[PDB]
Write a protein that binds this ligand. Structure first.
Ligand code: HEM
Ligand code: HEM
Ligand code: HEM
Ligand code: HEM
Length: 107
């Protein structure tokens, strides 16, 4: 089985880079994020060519990188989508986990 990498991983395809820690996500199954493609969980970098390689932040296709990290209603929960559910009605956790600035994702 593939192993989780070290914490402190920077996602840096954009000018708004974000650090991802596997240890804080250890209760989420690996394949919720490294989701099936052609029937197999895919552990390539999310923006690999042919994957979420469209860097237009307005794109909502299966290639849109921004969309895959921020939007609701997606086949797999996105970073923000899952965090909204986690925060619930708690506005402090909404700021921390889903705020566009001043949050745990973006300063
Ligand atoms: C579950 C224990 C689990 C495994 C296994 C796993 C593996 C993994 C690898 C091998 C990488 C590095 C990919 C590379 O070649 O650089 C990696 C990276 C990311 N992961 Fe992961 N991962 C596991 C679990 C989870 C969970 C539960 C999430 C989602 C909450 C998740 C997400 C990510 C992200 C994002 C990356 C960075 C990929 C990128 O920037 O393209 N992982 N993981
Ligand atoms: C990297 C860890 C990674 C993330 C994050 C990610 C997210 C993601 C979401 C949120 C969706 C749903 C979008 C929607 O509008 O429903 C989604 C869908 C697909 N992805 Fe993805 N994805 C990550 C990694 C990868 C990799 C490495 C590839 C390419 C091999 C890839 C591809 C796709 C495709 C295709 C879809 C659509 C799948 C289908 O409808 O069953 N993703 N991804
Ligand atoms: C998507 C790639 C993604 C990112 C980025 C991300 C970030 C993140 C941060 C920065 C935290 C705070 C802790 C830390 O610094 O590591 C955090 C915390 C939680 N997350 Fe997350 N997260 C991403 C994805 C997802 C997804 C897809 C889920 C659920 C399916 C999820 C869940 C959680 C949970 C739960 C936490 C803990 C919340 C807290 O209050 O302590 N994340 N994430
Ligand atoms: C709040 C809804 C919110 C906004 C708005 C937002 C914006 C934003 C921008 C403009 C980028 C860069 C896009 C580009 O291509 O130029 C970006 C990138 C990432 N974000 Fe974000 N973001 C908002 C909220 C959050 C939160 C709360 C998280 C984490 C749960 C998060 C995550 C990400 C990730 C991952 C990226 C990509 C980082 C990279 O590869 O450089 N965003 N966001």
């Amino acid at each position: 089985a593939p192993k989780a990498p070290a914490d402190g991983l920077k996602m840096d395809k954009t000018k708004q880079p974000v650090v991802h820690n596997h240890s804080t996500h250890k209760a989420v199954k690996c394949g919720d994020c490294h989701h099936p493609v052609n029937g197999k969980e895919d552990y390539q970098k999310c923006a690999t060519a042919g994957c979420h390689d469209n860097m237009d932040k307005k794109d909502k296709s299966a290639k849109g990188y921004y969309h895959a990290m921020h939007d609701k209603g997606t086949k797999f929960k996105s970073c923000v989508g899952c965090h909204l559910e986690t925060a619930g009605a708690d506005a402090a956790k909404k700021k921390e986990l889903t705020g566009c600035k001043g949050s745990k994702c973006h300063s």
